[PDB]
Each structure stands twice: as structure tokens, then as C-alpha cells.
Design a protein around this nucleic acid. Structure first.
Length: 364
RNA sequence: GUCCCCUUCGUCUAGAGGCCCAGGACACCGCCCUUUCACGGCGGUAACAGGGGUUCGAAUCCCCUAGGGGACGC
């Protein structure tokens, strides 16, 4: 009967997730983090009441709900670096650190230093399986819907001390168990947007943390075409917001981004969700993390994603340094964007990924 | 001033008297999808430069005013 502090978010998942441990035996207490100081009000309530939903489930379950405010560190170790790499015309995955710096550190820490427990549990639809003495990470069932990608930063240690209940179920079940128990959360917007921050519309959110200087938009044929109004507002393979409306000698295809020109403040577009300047045969990842937490030397042979919910695309990996890696896409990959993370899997297992900083241009 | 061609949704256009209260594409807007940003799916809004004629009927035919052509536009 160990102590288990589950992160109550007021989300359908979490809820079912606690009740599952509760049943599973465990002493179950839940904590609700408040990590973002909303500027607006329409935003507050939304996340304020998101708490009453959280609590009202702990009560209907008979569990104490703990308040905490890591908002301090959220900005400190996440949203800050967030805006950083963005300013640098790259696409960062806030959420990807939202787990590395908080939900599995900041939290985990405060679990025993205060709450005094010996098992943290998120509702992350992923699973944990210990073997040969090393705690291993691995995506749950319901393949389609799964979050292994967001936790490549975790280590066996961290994982081991964590509990992932629902990752065993299948999404429809979860969203139901809750409906049956009566948990107020069942029937609630699965959730979107930066973790902790609201599902608001980007352009207005990002355009409130950085400047706003227009520019020019060029075809892949070094010729004017559109008004680049802004730049951080886009990303390789983006389609919307490029004003373009086809012209005389255009395949009617929609236009997609292909490269940001940092200094010349350009916006190299093209045309066709398959155009050569939107594919690669590999890339190079830096800031690496292996759940295994073993040093990586030599050559590997696995699969790899390059954006959330992408699709296990075969690849070969070889060490290019003590921090960088050179992977080679078994087939061209679409819009490998720099800044996003690249998680490699060895099947059921998720070996952990790393940050992309270099794609591998398609041969002419 | 050489007495001939032009003009369609935001944009690129379909349209050669009744089938067009105008069609597609891209854009734009929305929903769905999704704990990043994106992709994707689905659907919606939207135009005959303007005024007269001719026909049972006109986007298309004629006429009238605001944009482009004639190796001489001395």
C-alpha cells in the first residue's frame, strides 16, 4: 500500500487513471499544478474551473487534492527557452519539456520532499515495463492515440518512480469508465495547445511574446510571390497563412513552406505536398536522451518519428559525436523540421529521442 | 493621334444565346482531427466593370463612358 500522487488535471484521462490505482489498491492522493499566470480572464476561468472539475473527481472518488504552483519554474525552464528557439526561426515543442522540466522533475521532486509518496502517476497514455533491472518506456495500446513521443526525455530512474495506469486501457474505455463511475470529467475536450497553457490561437499568443516585422515570400525559383508578414509564425511544411492564390503557370496545388531565411528575412515557399524541397533522407539530432541513459556509440537500426503522431518510419542510426546523431531515412521524409524532437523506437519500446538541428536535403 | 483587340468570386480561371440565380482551383472562414507548431479530412462564403438595347430568353449579341496594341506610334 505505497503512496501514489497522481497529477489531477481535471481531464477525462487522469480521473479514470486515479480510480484505477485506487482500485488497484494503492494509497491515492492527487495534486493539481497551476503553472501559468493567464493574462486574460476568458482564459482564467477556463483553467480555474478546470480545477473544480479536478477536485470534484477526487471528492467523488474520496481523495485529497493538493494545490501547487510551479508556474515559477514553468516559465523559468520551459516557456522561456520556448520563445527563444522560436525567435531564432525554429519550431520548438514546449510540451516536450513540459514533461522534462516539470511533470517528471519539478513535480516528482515535490512528491517526496513534501507530499511524501513513493510513486508519481500522470495520466500519460503510455506504459512502463521493468525488465533485467532497468525500468523501460513504451507506448500503450490503442496505438493510434498514444503519447510516448512526449516523454523521450525521461530516464529509467524517473520512469521507474512513476506509474502509468491508463496506458494499458484503450481510449474509448477510459472515456467510459469515467462516464460510468460518474466522474464529472467524462465528456471533456481531450485537450490541445501548449501543456498548461490554453488551446488559444497561436498567432495572437506568439505575437504577444515576440515582435512583428513583415518581409518577402519567395518561390523556390528566387522570385517574389507573397508578403511574408512576420516569420516565426510559420514552419516548414506549413500551408495556411501564405496568402497565395495560384497563378498562370501553377499546378493549382496549394503552396507550402520549405525554408526560412533567418537574416534575409525570407519565406521560401513552393508547391505540392510532395515537392522535393520538402523532403529529406535523414537528419542530425543533438541534445540526445536515451530512456536507457546509456552512452550511445556505434550504429543502430530502428524506426523514428519527427513530429508527434507521425508514423514509425524505418531508419539507421550512427553516432556522429558524443551528442549528435546521423540517421538515414529508409525513404524520404516530409518536412523534417529543425527544433522538433526525433523519437526513436525499437518496437514496443521507446528508446528516447533528441533535438533536430539539421535535416538531410534531397539530392537535387 | 493609324477608324482594332480587352474586363468574370480575394486571386488564376471555366463560359464560344437558353444546360450559369455562373463551374473548378488556390486563398479566406468554420468544424473534425490533435496535449507542440504543423499536415490531413470535411464543409461553407464569394464574381459576370457600369448603363442601355436586341431577342420568348442574354455572362455570351449591338451601342454608348473609366485599363492595353500597330519594327514610323516625326
Amino acid at each position: 500500500a505505497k503512496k501514489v500522487i497522481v497529477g489531477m488535471s481535471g481531464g477525462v484521462d487522469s480521473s479514470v487513471s486515479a480510480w484505477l490505482l485506487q482500485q488497484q489498491g494503492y494509497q491515492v492522493e492527487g495534486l493539481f499544478m497551476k503553472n501559468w499566470e493567464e493574462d486574460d480572464g476568458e482564459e482564467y476561468c477556463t483553467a480555474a474551473a478546470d480545477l473544480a472539475d479536478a477536485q470534484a473527481v477526487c471528492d467523488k472518488l474520496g481523495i485529497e487534492l493538493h494545490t501547487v504552483n510551479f508556474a515559477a519554474e514553468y516559465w523559468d525552464n520551459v516557456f522561456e527557452l520556448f520563445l527563444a528557439e522560436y525567435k531564432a526561426g525554429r519550431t520548438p515543442n514546449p510540451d516536450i519539456l513540459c514533461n522534462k522540466e516539470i511533470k517528471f522533475k519539478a513535480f516528482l521532486e515535490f512528491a517526496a520532499e513534501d507530499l511524501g509518496a513513493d510513486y508519481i502517476a500522470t495520466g500519460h497514455y503510455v506504459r512502463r515495463a521493468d525488465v533485467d533491472g532497468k525500468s523501460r518506456l513504451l507506448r500503450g495500446l490503442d496505438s493510434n492515440k498514444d503519447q510516448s513521443y512526449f516523454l523521450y526525455t525521461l530516464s529509467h530512474e524517473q520512469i521507474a518512480q512513476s506509474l502509468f495506469p491508463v496506458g494499458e486501457l484503450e481510449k474509448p474505455q477510459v472515456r467510459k469508465i469515467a462516464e460510468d463511475l460518474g466522474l464529472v470529467t467524462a465528456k471533456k475536450k481531450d485537450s490541445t495547445g501548449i501543456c498548461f497553457i490554453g488551446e488559444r490561437k497561436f498567432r495572437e499568443f506568439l505575437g504577444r511574446y515576440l515582435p512583428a516585422q513583415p518581409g518577402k515570400i519567395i518561390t523556390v525559383d528566387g522570385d517574389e510571390i507573397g508578403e511574408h508578414q512576420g516569420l516565426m509564425y510559420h514552419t516548414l511544411g506549413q500551408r495556411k497563412g501564405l496568402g497565395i492564390g495560384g497563378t498562370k503557370e501553377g499546378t493549382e496545388e496549394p503552396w507550402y513552406v520549405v525554408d526560412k531565411d533567418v537574416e534575409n528575412n525570407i519565406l521560401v515557399v513552393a508547391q505540392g505536398h510532395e515537392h522535393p524541397r520538402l523532403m529529406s533522407v535523414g537528419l542530425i539530432a543533438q541534445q540526445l536522451h536515451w530512456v536507457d541513459r546509456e552512452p550511445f556509440t556505434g550504429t543502430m537500426r530502428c524506426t523514428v518519428k519527427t513530429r508527434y503522431r507521425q508514423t514509425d518510419i524505418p531508419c539507421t542510426v550512427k553516432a556522429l559525436d558524443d551528442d549528435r546523431i546521423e540517421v538515414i531515412f529508409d525513404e524520404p521524409v516530409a518536412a523534417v523540421t529543425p527544433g522538433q524532437s526525433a523519437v526513436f523506437y525499437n518496437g514496443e519500446v521507446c528508446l528516447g529521442g533528441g533535438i533536430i538541428e539539421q535535416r538531410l536535403p534531397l539530392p537535387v
